[PDB]
Amino acid sequence: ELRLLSKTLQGQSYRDQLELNPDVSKAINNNIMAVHIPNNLRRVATNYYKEIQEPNSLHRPCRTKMEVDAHIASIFLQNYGSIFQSLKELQKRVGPDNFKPQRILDVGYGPATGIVALNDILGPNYRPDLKDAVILGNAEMQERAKIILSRQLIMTNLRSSIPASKEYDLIILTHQLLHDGNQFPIQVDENIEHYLNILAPGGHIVIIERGNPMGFEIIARARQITLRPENFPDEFGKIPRPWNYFLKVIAPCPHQRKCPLQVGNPNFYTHKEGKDLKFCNFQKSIKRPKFSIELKKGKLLATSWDNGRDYEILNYSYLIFERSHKDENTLKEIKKLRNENVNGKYDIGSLGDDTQNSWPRIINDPVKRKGHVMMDLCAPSGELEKWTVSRSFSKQIYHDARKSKKGDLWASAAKTQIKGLGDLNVKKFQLKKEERQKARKAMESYN
Template sequence: MLAIRRIPSRLAPLTRRNNSTARLLPQTLRAQCHRPQVALNPDVAKAINNNILSLDQPNNLRRVAKNNFLRLQTENLHRAPFTSLEVDAHIASIFVQNYASVYQTLMELKKRMSSRGKVWMPDKVLDVGFGPATGIVALNDIFQDVEFKPRLKDAVILGSLDMQRKAKIILSRQRHEVVDAKDDEDSIPREEIVDEVDVAAAADQDDLIGEVMTKKIKTVTRLSGRLPVKNKYDLIIVTQQLLQHESKFNTQVDENLEKFLKLLAPGGHIVIIERGNPLGFEIVAKARQIMIRPENYPDEHGKIPRPWLRGVQMENSEAPTPMEHNYYLNIVAPCPHHRKCPLQTGNPHFYSFKEGKDLKTCTFQKSIERPKFNMELKRGKLLATEWNDEEGARPSRDLRGTGRPNGRNYEIVNYSYLIAERSLADKETISKIEQMREEQLHNFEIGSLGDNTPDTWPRIISQPIKRKGHVILDLCAPSGKLEKWTIPKSFSKEIYHDARKAMKGDLWGLDAKTKIKGRGSLNVTKFENLEKERIKQTKKESRVKERELAETFNQLSNDELEIDEQSVEKIETLSTIYGHYYEDAEKKGN
């Protein structure tokens, strides 16, 4: 008689034994980030290809896209596109990367809310960025299989009016952007409604290629070039908008963050996304520091919401009123604690030093499938060969593309993100928060799993190191420290199996055999001294350069200007001088 193997209870709900998640423990499933490869909505991709990029010469797009990537390597910050060609090049190249980072971050927020037993579906949404309403496009795709009708969807597109027109084309291909004719017939003449239906029907029939009359396109999302001042939003998506000039890092992040937090409704979430480079990470870490002020609570553990008092309006009193204390913020992800960030340096210049090359950052990666227009763009010669060093930029294999007909159809996006939550304003919630602040029940030491909920589970910040018989995890832990956990096969076969399936960006809700403190403390003093030397040397070089230019300028001013070859050389020299002062003013943000 054959023995019948009993299936463990944890596998009972799964119908397929060969499913990739069949052997994973429940904690692992709750801890995993969104795994599937991100792909742009095919209808959106088709609209971009047929109705936006088809109007440009491919080589012109490649040239502008190449310059954008080169500038990003040198400046590390996005600039708003202004001309029509710059807008199209942004959509052809950078939009896909931003879409992937926003989509993955919103999926993280959705899963974290689900782990609390809540159905997350924001009712008022605000998206702010340079791109074509990237946050709204990603949000619509996340809820594409369910009914999603927020009362308010606003997209603020900074820079170009032409980008707003292109955003209309992209949004019009999403089902959640279709305007109900019954709701809109009072404000739109009947003949325009008929024209819209005809245009939509024609678009559905065939792949029409060419320019679109965007004036007749109606979308649920309201497009604007200015930040609203009156509305409060349940979800605010901020993509690369906290810093415009690196020289103003310490003040600009603070000022911009305050503007957005003023628009956040009680119980709402703000999602901040930056590039996955050292500057992007430091921007996110700075925003986190401003919101929860870990330096003011050195002995506090857990994720108790912290009071936010910036921007509070005082009404004929020297101290805030009780209601003004009811504004609390909590970090949802990626941090498992509210203590000082163990990777934050506080100064992006530290990474440029020779000694700063080993500094780590909290950045994440996501794979996105390249749509047709993106693959065609990067197969071109300008993005397929090594870039020259004319503009002082370092060539990058990840950005230049392969140039092969059968090259890879995906790319890896690097990004840093932060999700924060504003507490509700009802008396019961405020009373509970104040009680938690008074009791201070938690004291998480090295090796702790927090309060055994996903909110305080450690986060895997490096790709797990898999060795024969054991796995090593680098974690940002609820203790506020970087920790290194080792899971050998002898510890637990099930936990060992799940550790081998873990990836960077996942939470870790299981135990380990060995738990020790990770990398040593950051020697900030050493980098501060190097920074002082850098500033001193920069000022010295600037004074020498200005002195030389001033002498040249005075000499040219005293000479009589005649139209000959020598005068042309003088004019070129003067343009160089003025160009120097212009570039210097740009760097200072003036």
């Protein structure tokens, strides 16, 4: 008789496993690899993988044609999964009604990948005005991108660079905010400043990155520069934020204060004192198509470089902003809501607005023991919280909590609500002359 609440269902993130469109996968397996003997495709894919194992490395545009084929074979799947999950999140958190964008820009290294994901998400009847798609790495990626997009039903415009005379209302960025291991803090600023100029009022920007500590640091910096948390202290909740221009975080963040997990420099993760550091990433599972299953075979991609699955778990970090509209109403509305709305210090345990926009974010796999569920949340209080839901507190809420997963929004109260210790190893991030003088002093003291 006990079932999930409608509120809890609203808080849940898209749970189903990912799968490519059957037409897209069949086309890929038939054309993009059937002309290739597996061994050399595996060789090039191994080359690409080995240069992204390096800690806090970055993705890299496909230089050559064989690299185009290899990228579609090996890197396309997880990029598609990340964009699909991010777009489902956006659609749900703005309501499926308000998400009918007409001016679409997708920028990434793979084929038109946010475009095919958007096609899958909004169905075969979605036929918007403009479906620009800039492909960076190579010209030949565009031809196979047309091959992919043919099997979905073309009005997708495959470019090599951003058209520079138009705004957009849905922009997708995949691995685009950084290109150098060094240069890291400021290239993010430059790149986001570039794409925010072309974000139409009311539009969405969806940023997706690798899902490793470097990727999380990129999203954290991109969040910080857009928001300026330090410039609006004691401002809880989500109000659009200046950057006539305003923008608000939709997902995954339930607040606009300082990210609790951010330590500025990615290199701290590499040390032996930042090994307990935590970073904000999210996981999904995606079925392996045949061409993927047939690729990862042999001593190159199947052994341990020093049972299989039918799916891959992809890690990714992501961020979503909306730009406000332009109107005398909206402007003065933001001013008044910032002026006379003392929303109050959102204390630990608060749910904020008790809507999608302020519900806590589950950012760790909850621990589910008999009669109690422990969740690590990024709360709307700007902080990192640990909530325990027990049966004795409430049968219904415990029932809902026992099915919650990482990446959901937790929409219900809990009994025990304490400060999470995931940020413990964060705050903790001339002697030569003293040694010399002490040496001489002790040496003259022995006498």
